[PDB]
Amino acid sequence: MSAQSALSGLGAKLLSGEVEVVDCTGVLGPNTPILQLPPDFAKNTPKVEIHKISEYDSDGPFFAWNWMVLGEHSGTHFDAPHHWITGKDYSDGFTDTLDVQRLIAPVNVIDCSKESAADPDFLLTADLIKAWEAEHGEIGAGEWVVMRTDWDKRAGDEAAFLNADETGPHSPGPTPDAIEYLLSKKIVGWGSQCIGTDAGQAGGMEPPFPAHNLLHRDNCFGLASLANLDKLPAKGAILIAAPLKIERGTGSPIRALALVPK
Amino acid sequence: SAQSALSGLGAKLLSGEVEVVDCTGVLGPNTPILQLPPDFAKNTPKVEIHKISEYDSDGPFFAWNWMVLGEHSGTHFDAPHHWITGKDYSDGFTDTLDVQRLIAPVNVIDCSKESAADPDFLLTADLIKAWEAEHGEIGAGEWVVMRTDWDKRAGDEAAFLNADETGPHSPGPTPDAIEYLLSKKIVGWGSQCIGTDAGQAGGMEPPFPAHNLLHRDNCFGLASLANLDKLPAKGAILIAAPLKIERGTGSPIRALALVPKA
Ligand SMILES: O=C(O)C(=O)c1ccccc1S
Ligand SMILES: O=C(O)C(=O)c1ccccc1S
Ligand SMILES: [Ca+2]
Ligand SMILES: [Ca+2]
Ligand SMILES: [Ca+2]
Ligand SMILES: [Ca+2]
Ligand SMILES: [Ca+2]
Ligand SMILES: [Ca+2]
Ligand SMILES: [Mn+2]
Ligand SMILES: [Mn+2]
């Protein structure tokens, strides 16, 4: 029941496989889907590039390695509060100044996959979250909450992943009141399997991009392009979602990992 | 059971009874980066951070950056493909390795005093055996890290690389040290220096035995680890997970340790 026993126990169960590490990360490379914004509205974050330095050749006889062109907000990634104007004044709101204690926490996995398959603009509401809590247990302070949509099935095709038509991107997300409600429970942050933490059509919500707006307003975090949420239980897993320690970073690609039973 | 264990661990993380320790240095333009003889090999590039927008006409509501980022930059992870000796492992890339292996108990071997006295200090098999006699045997799947407090030098790249006419002078393991650890079936070896080997490992047999032997055995390397002085010799869990770079040879990481409180 001591912390040391918990950690030794974790170590043993990892070796035996009784605790499994789930990879919640998509592949990071040139094909990784990247956010597209209207050019008149904002500059785009760049597509990922991987450049060879050497691979056991005359440029590097005994070793292989690469360098990258890499936006902070690329692939499975982390949003720090400085990312949004509402979080701009937190001195601790950068990837290098935030509290790493907050990064590893129990995760609440809200399965919206059937609803999102039927309607790509599916919105998770405060009422639906409360019904989820009624069934699974209350969402608690410091916990991660992630919206499972199985949108990662589309990640091999950027067009399919952004899912845009004449009126813009169509991908599921939260309502402003859903995020407001989660924040009232003092969550650490909110995660999506889509290109961002907000619905594709959030550009037209009040406020616009409410997850971004409200999370970062409250010094909380966002996660995007999460994979393999279908391998997690609704309750009980621990999510590890840690940004690179980028100097004054607004966000970071991550290796999101989850600990799950069995 | 596994679920009860994860619930108990989750509660302790939320409460701080298990502390998350940041073992990562800041990643930015001033991060020390390996230098190689240009007649020998091309260099991995210095880190660059470039503004896309900061709540301005380029992006009115948000701030974000993009990076020039070598795989092998700052606190970072070496996958087996990084060395010629690990080239044939299909699971030897950051996107094909087994994430189950990345989280494990860590052995923190304090060589800080020895390293302050002699920057070319070498950890030997006999010294590791003496550490085990005091602290306990090193076990299968565990991380082993060499604490030197070299991270205290990261503010001055020249001091961090510490080169003179005969090359870099920084502490590391002997060949027999790495062979001994590998016989205990460790997952990986970590350093606070620019790489996993001693600065003078070029004249060793074999050259750069950490790189050579670790990756020969499909095991991992960690470099530029920070804050090992905040870890116990035994009992902590280390989380060291590379980005899921497509065919990646390594990656910057947010190295985090779990340490127990009471
Ligand atoms: O990458 C992000 O954090 C993200 O989702 C985003 C970034 C910039 C502008 C709008 C959005 S909606
Ligand atoms: O993998 C690394 O960053 C590393 O330590 C290294 C890389 C290339 C050449 C020599 C070394 S010694
Ligand atoms: Ca704390
Ligand atoms: Ca419709
Ligand atoms: Ca999958
Ligand atoms: Ca300096
Ligand atoms: Ca030499
Ligand atoms: Ca320290
Ligand atoms: Mn983002
Ligand atoms: Mn390296």
Residue closest via CA to ligand 2's atom 5 equals: B195
- From B40, B64, B66, select the one nearest B54 (Cα to Cα): B64
Place of tokens 């509205």: A41
Token digits for A103? Answer: 């990064």
Q: Is the peptide bond before A207 cis (omega within 30 degrees of 0)?
A: yes
AA identity, residue B168: P
* Ligand nearest to the CA of residue A121, numbered in listed order: 4
* DSSP string covering B93-147: STTTS-GGGSEEEEEEEE-HHHHHH-TT-EE-HHHHHHHHHHH----TT-EEEEE
Which positions of B are catalytic? 82
d(CA A53, CA B113): 36
Ligand 2 atom at minimal distance to the Cα of residue B221: 1
Cα of first residue to Cα of last residue in chain B, in angstroms, is: 23
- Cα dist. A19→A14, B10, B124, B133, B238 in Å? 5, 13, 34, 30, 16
Lining ligand 1 with CB less than 6 A are: A 35, 73, 79, 83, 196-198, 209, 212, 224, 251; B 62
For this PDB entry, the determination method is X-ray
CB burial of B171-207 (b: ≥16 within 10 Å; e: otherwise) equals bbbbbebbebbeebebbbbbbbbbbbbbbbbeebeee
Distance of alpha carbon B64 from alpha carbon B48, whole angstroms: 14
Residue type, B91: D
Q: Are B65 and A72 inside 8 Å of each other by CB?
A: yes
User: Resolution of the deposited coordinates, in angstroms?
Assistant: 1.9
CATH number of A1-262: 3.50.30.50
Where are the domains positioned within chain B? 1-262
